[PDB]
Amino acid sequence: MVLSEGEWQLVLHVWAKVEADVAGHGQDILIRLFKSHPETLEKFDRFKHLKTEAEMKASEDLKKHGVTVLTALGAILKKKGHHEAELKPLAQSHATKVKIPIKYLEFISEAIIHVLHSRHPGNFGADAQGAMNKALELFRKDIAAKYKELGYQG
Numbered sequence: 001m002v003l004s005e006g007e008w009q010l011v012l013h014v015w016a017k018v019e020a021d022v023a024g025h026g027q028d029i030l031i032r033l034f035k036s037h038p039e040t041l042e043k044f045d046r047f048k049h050l051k052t053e054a055e056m057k058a059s060e061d062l063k064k065h066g067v068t069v070l071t072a073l074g075a076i077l078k079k080k081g082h083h084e085a086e087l088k089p090l091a092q093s094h095a096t097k098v099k100i101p102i103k104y105l106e107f108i109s110e111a112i113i114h115v116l117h118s119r120h121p122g123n124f125g126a127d128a129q130g131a132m133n134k135a136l137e138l139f140r141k142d143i144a145a146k147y148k149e150l151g152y153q154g
């Protein structure tokens with residue numbers, strides 16, 4: 001699909017707020033996902049053992065992984081649709097190194113939206129949430145088409 005410049009602006013305006021605290025946002029989102037959808041935790045042989053939110057909150061490995069996730073996602077969004085190059089190694093690692101179905105991308109999309117709504121209500125009204133949801137669907141559909149070229153679902 002295609003985002004208008006107005007929509008991208010709404011996306012990058014909240015994101016600028018997120019980047020004020022990348023690790024904290026990273027943590028909130030991954031724990032939102034693990035609680036909300038515990039089966040997702042199973043994909044990480046690194047975190048598999050964390051039993052309660054308190055254990056999640058205090059794992060430094062998890063917080064680090066959350067910076068990595070948000071730094072790569074931020075890089076893609078800042079490309080404003082021209083993210084072919086950024087998408088290729090992402091799709092490869094999530095389709096053959098480990099296999100992450102599109103369903104799970106939807107779940108983490110939902111957690112991102114959850115967290116932005118909680119921490120940035122004045123910058124995350126309805127218009128801003130629809131733009132962000134548009135940006136994430138575009139990511140997922142492009143990733144899905146890449147998955148398919150690489151030999152996996154999509």
Ligand code: HEM
Nearest residue numbers: 040041043044046068069072073090093098100104105108
């Ligand atoms: C916003 C969506 C996502 C982004 C931007 C993202 C990004 C990344 C990046 C940059 C890495 C490390 C570098 C590499 O790929 O080798 C990584 C690793 C990984 N991701 Fe994701 N990912 C996303 C979603 C997910 C989801 C939804 C799951 C599972 C429920 C997942 C599972 C994994 C696993 C299992 C690893 C490797 C674990 C390890 O470090 O040993 N990813 N991800």
